[PDB]
Amino acid sequence: SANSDAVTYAKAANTRTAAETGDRIEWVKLSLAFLPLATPVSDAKVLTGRQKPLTEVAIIIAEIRSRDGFEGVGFSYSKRAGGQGIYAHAKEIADNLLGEDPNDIDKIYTKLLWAGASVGRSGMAVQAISPIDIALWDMKAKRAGLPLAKLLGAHRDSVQCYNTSGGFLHTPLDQVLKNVVISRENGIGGIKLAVGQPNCAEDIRRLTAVREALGDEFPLMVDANQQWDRETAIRMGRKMEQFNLIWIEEPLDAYDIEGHAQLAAALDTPIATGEMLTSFREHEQLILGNASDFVQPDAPRVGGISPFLKIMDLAAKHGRKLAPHFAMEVHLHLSAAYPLEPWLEHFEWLNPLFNEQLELRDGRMWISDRHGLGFTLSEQARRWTQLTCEFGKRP
Amino acid sequence: SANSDAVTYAKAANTRTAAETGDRIEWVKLSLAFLPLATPVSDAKVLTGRQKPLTEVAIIIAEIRSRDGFEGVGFSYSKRAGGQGIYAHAKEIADNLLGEDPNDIDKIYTKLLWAGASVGRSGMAVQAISPIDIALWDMKAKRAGLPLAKLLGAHRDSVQCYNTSGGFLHTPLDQVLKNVVISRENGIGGIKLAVGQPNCAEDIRRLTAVREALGDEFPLMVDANQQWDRETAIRMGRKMEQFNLIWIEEPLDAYDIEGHAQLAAALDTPIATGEMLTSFREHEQLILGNASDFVQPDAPRVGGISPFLKIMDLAAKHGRKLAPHFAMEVHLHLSAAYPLEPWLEHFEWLNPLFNEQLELRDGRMWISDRHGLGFTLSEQARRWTQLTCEFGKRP
Ligand SMILES: O=C(O)[C@@H](O)[C@H](O)[C@@H](O)[C@@H](O)C(=O)O
Ligand SMILES: O=C(O)[C@@H](O)[C@H](O)[C@@H](O)[C@@H](O)C(=O)O
Ligand SMILES: [Mg+2]
Ligand SMILES: [Mg+2]
C-alpha cells in the first residue's frame, strides 16, 4: 500500500544538498580589446552622414574559472562608441560573481542586474552582462562535454550561411563582384548586399549586377541599415520584388514598428530587422507588432544567451524565422537550436581572435565537436587587448 | 588587420563534427506499474458523483541507455483510466528513439510527434512522450554531473512544501486534525484542504476547524476540484476571504477560463488552476485569459519537462506564481528553477517507487546532491510492474 488512513513521512539518508556540493566561481578576468579594420567600412548610415566609417570593433571578453576546474569564455562587442562603457560597467559588477554556483546562470544574471539597478534592464548594462552570461553557458556546455548547440538541444548539425563583409557600400561594384566569386568558391550559401544609399538608382544598379552574376537561384538579400523613409521603402521594396530576395533588411528606423509591419504586410518578400535592439522587451514589441518575417537578435547586444533564448521562443510562437546578427561564433549554436530553418551571417573580422575556425561546406556552417562555443582565445586577442582586470584567484 | 579591400576566408583543421561524434540511444525499456492505495482516496469529484474513489495510480516508466554509457529515467502517471493507453502508445513509438542523439531533446520530441501525428499534440499522446522526455532530461543532467535543477539553473536550493494527502474528503475531521499535527511535526510548510462537497456548510466547518488548529499564520489552502458553479464559487470565495488562504484551487471547471478570470479579479485571495490541462497550448489559453494567480502545470500531464519549461516562461512573463501538481520527484527541480517563489505539493504515494527520499525540513523540500532527478527505481517498483517491453540492445 502506498497510502493509509493517516499521513506518513519518509526519511532520507544522503543528507548532502546541492547547495553544499555545487561548483563555485573563483576567478574572473575581463578584457577590452580592439579589432582593427585596415579598410574602413561604410554602410548606408555613413553614406547619409549619420556616422563615420567603421575602423575597428571593440571586443569585451570575460573568462571565468571555477573551483572544480571548469572554464568559460564569452564576449560582447561594440561598433563605434560603447566599448569603454561596456567594459567599465562589467568591471564594476564582476566582483559579484565570486563564490556563486556557476550553474545558476539566471540567478547570477539577476544578482548582476540588482547590483546595477540604477542603470536599467536594457542597453549597455546588459551588454556588460553578455560576456559573463555567455561565458557561463560556455562553461556549462563544457561541464557536460558538449558543443553549446547540444547542451541546448539542436535541430540541425549545420546552418545555411551568407556573407556580408564583401558587399558594403564603400566597395566599388567591380570589387563586390570579385568578392562574390571568392565567397562562392569558398562555399558560401548566400550574399547580402548593403543598400539604402541616397542614390536609389545606384543601389538598383549594384543589385541587378549581383543578381546577374549569381544566377536566379542563389540566395540573395539586401540591407538598408534604416536609411529609407516609408515612401522610399515601399517604393524600393515593390521594385525589388523582381529579385526574389530572401529578405529586405532594416528598411526603416529600428524602432518604426508600424512602418515595418506595414511593409511586411504589403510585400511578399520577407522583411528582416532587430539587430539594433538591446533587450528581450524591445524585441517583444517588434514581434507583437508583427514588424518582420525574420527576427534578427544579437546575443551580445540583447544581454547574452539567456535573453536570446527567450527571444527565440517568442519568435517561434509567432512563426517567425531567425537570422541572428554578427558573432557567428555564438549564433551558430543558437541558430542550430532554433525550431525553424535559420540563416547565419558571415564576417571574417573575428577570425584572428580565435585559434579555431568554423568549417564552411556547401553553403552551410558546420558545428564542430569542440565543447561549449568551441573557441579558444588567440595570441592576437591578447595583443589587441588594451585594458584588463581580474577578480579572485586562479584555482 | 581583421579585414581587407576584398573578402577573406580561413580554414578549419579540427574537421570532426558534432554530428559524427555525438552519443546515441541504443536501448529503451518501458514499464507500466500500479501504485496500490489501500485507503481509497476521494475528493469532491467523488462526493458529487462524477467519479469513484481512487484506489491506485498507474505509473508509466521509461529507461533509456546511450552508447557512451549514460542512463536516464523518467515517468508519467494516470489517476484512473488512461494508464493502459499511455503505455500502449509509448510502446508503439519508443523504437523511434534508437540511433538518435539523446541531447537533441526537442528534435526527438518532434520526431515522436510525427510518428503519432494522427493522435494529436495534446492529451494522452504527449503523456506517452512524457516519460521519455523526462528520462532524456535526467540523462543530460547526469551527463553534466548535476542535479536536474542545476542543469536548468536554480533560483533556490529548496522549495516551500505543503501536504495534500492528509486533507481529503473521505477523511473524518478529527483524523484531518491528527494528520495536520503529524504533517507539521514532520516539518511541512503548508496544508491543503479538499473542499467542494455538496454540503457547503460542512466544508466551512472543516476549514474553520483546521485554521483554528494551525493558527493564524500557517500557510493554508483549499481545493474544490472543479466542483463549484460560478454562483457558488464567488459565494464561497467571499466567505473564505477571512481565512487568508494562500489560494483557492480549481473552484470551477478546468476549462472555464472567463469564470476563473472573473473569480481572480473579484477576490483578493489568489486563485489557482491548471493541473487537469494536458498541453502548452491549453495552459496558454488560460494564461492569456488571466484565469489564475497561480499556474499549476503537471509535467507528466503536459508532455514532459520541455513543454513544462515553456509554460513556466509564459507564466513568469505574466507575473504568475508557480505551484506544480503532484510528482514532486520531478517538480522539485522545475520549481527550483522558477524565478518567483513557488510551492511544491507533497504526497507519500510515490515514495516506495524509489530508493532515495527527499529531505523535508523547516517547511521546505531540499534538493539533494544526487544527479539528474536523483532517484533510482526500487525493487518494489519492479514488483508493481504489470507490463514491460524493451527496444535495442543494452550497451
Ligand atoms: O548586418 C550586418 O552585419 C550589418 O548591418 C553591420 O552591423 C553593419 O551595420 C556594421 O558593420 C557597420 O558597418 O556599421
Ligand atoms: O492537487 C491535488 O493533489 C488533487 O487535485 C489530486 O490531484 C486529486 O484530485 C486526486 O488525487 C484524486 O483523488 O482524484
Ligand atoms: Mg544589417
Ligand atoms: Mg488539486
Phi and psi for B327 in degrees, rounded to 5? 25, 60
Q: Which residue of A lies nearest to B145 if distances are taken between CA atoms?
A: A144
Q: Which residue of A lies nearest to B104 if distances are taken between CA atoms?
A: A153
> For ligand 2, is residue B56 a contact (CB within 6 Å)?
no
Domain spanning A16-145+379-395 has what CATH number?
Answer: 3.30.390.10
**Technique of determination:** X-ray
Q: Which of B9, B161, B185 to mutate to probe the A interface, most A CBs <10 Å? A: B9
| Cell matching residue A241 | 520584388
**Which amino acid, residue B29?**
K
With beta carbons less than 8 A apart as the criterion, state whether A259 and A252 touch.
Answer: yes
Q: Which top CATH class is A146-378? A: alpha beta
Q: How does DSSP assign B86-119, residue by residue?
A: HHHHHHHHGGGGTT--TT-HHHHHHHHHHHTGGG
With beta carbons less than 8 A apart as the criterion, state whether A383 and A348 touch.
Answer: no
Q: How many residues does chain B have?
A: 395
Alpha-carbon gap: B326 to the closest alpha carbon of chain A (Å): 14
Q: Where are the domains of chain B?
A: 16-145+379-395, 146-378
Q: How does DSSP assign A255-302, residue by residue?
A: T-HHHHHHHHHH-SS-EEE-TT--SHHHHHHHHHTT--SEE---HHHH
Ligand 1 pocket test, candidate residues A225, A322, A325, most atoms within 8 A of CB: A225
d(CA B395, CA B393) in angstroms, rounded, equals 6
Alpha-carbon gap: A12 to the closest alpha carbon of chain B (Å): 5
The number of beta carbons lying within 10 Å of the beta carbon of residue B231 is 8
Angle at B129 between CA B123 and CA B133, to 5 degrees: 130
Closest CA to A327 of A354, A362, A307: A354
Query: What resolution in angstroms does the PDB record give?
Result: 2.2
Say what the alpha-carbon torsion angle A383, A386, A389, A393 is, to the nearest 10 degrees.
10
Q: How far is the CA of A324 from the centre of ligand 1 (A)?
A: 12
Alpha-carbon radius of gyration of chain A: 23
Judged by CB atoms closer than 8 Å, whether chains meet at B2 and A351 is answered as: yes
Please list every residue in chain A whose beta carbon sits closer than 8 Å to the beta carbon of residue B337.
Answer: 106
Please list every residue in chain B whose beta carbon sits closer than 8 Å to the beta carbon of residue A348.
Answer: 2-3, 7-10
Say what the alpha-carbon torsion angle A143, A149, A150, A152 is, to the nearest 10 degrees.
80
Q: How far is the CA of A120 from the centre of ligand 1 (A)?
A: 25
DSSP H/E element including B249 = strand B248-249
Pocket of ligand 1 (CB under 6 A): A 41, 43, 54, 79, 164, 223, 225, 275, 325-326, 345
| Cell matching residue A136 | 557561463
Query: Which of B7, B10, B158 is the closest to A163 by Cβ?
Result: B7
Q: How does DSSP assign B127-159, residue by residue?
A: HHHHHHHHHHHHHHHHHTTSBHHHHH--S-SEE
Q: Atom 8 (ligand 1): residue with closest C-alpha?
A: A43
d(CA B325, CA B297) in angstroms, rounded, equals 6
Q: How far is the CA of B94 from the centre of ligand 2 (A)?
A: 29
Q: Which residues share a beta bridge with B354?
A: B377
Which conformational region is residue A53 in: left (phi greater than 0), alpha (psi within -120 to 50 degrees), or beta? beta
Burial (Cβ within 10 Å: 0-12, 13-18, ≥19) of residue A15: exposed
Judged by CB atoms closer than 8 Å, whether chains meet at B104 and A150 is answered as: yes
A378: Cα separation from own chain's centroid = 21
For A23-79, give the secondary structure using H, E and C: CCEEEEEEEEEEEEEEEEECCHHHHCCCCCCEEEEEEEEEEEEECCCCEEEEEEEEE
A31: Cα separation from own chain's centroid = 19
Judged by CB atoms closer than 8 Å, whether chains meet at A3 and B349 is answered as: yes
Please list every residue in chain B whose beta carbon sits closer than 8 Å to the beta carbon of residue A18.
Answer: 146-147, 149-150, 154, 157, 367-369
Q: Which residues share a beta bridge with B388?
A: B31
d(CA A226, CA A193) in angstroms, rounded, equals 14
Q: Which residue has the cell 542597453?
A: A123
Query: Which of A165, A313, A348 is the closest to B310 by Cβ?
Result: A313
Q: How far is the CA of A305 from the centre of ligand 1 (A)?
A: 20
Burial (Cβ within 10 Å: 0-12, 13-18, ≥19) of residue A199: exposed
Angle between helices B200-214 and B173-185 (to 10 degrees): 30
Please list every residue in chain A whose beta carbon sits closer than 8 Å to the beta carbon of residue B144.
Answer: 140, 143-144, 151
With beta carbons less than 8 A apart as the criterion, state whether A115 and A45 touch.
Answer: no
- Alpha helix (H) residue ranges in A157-229: 173-185, 200-214
Per DSSP, the three-state class of B61 is strand
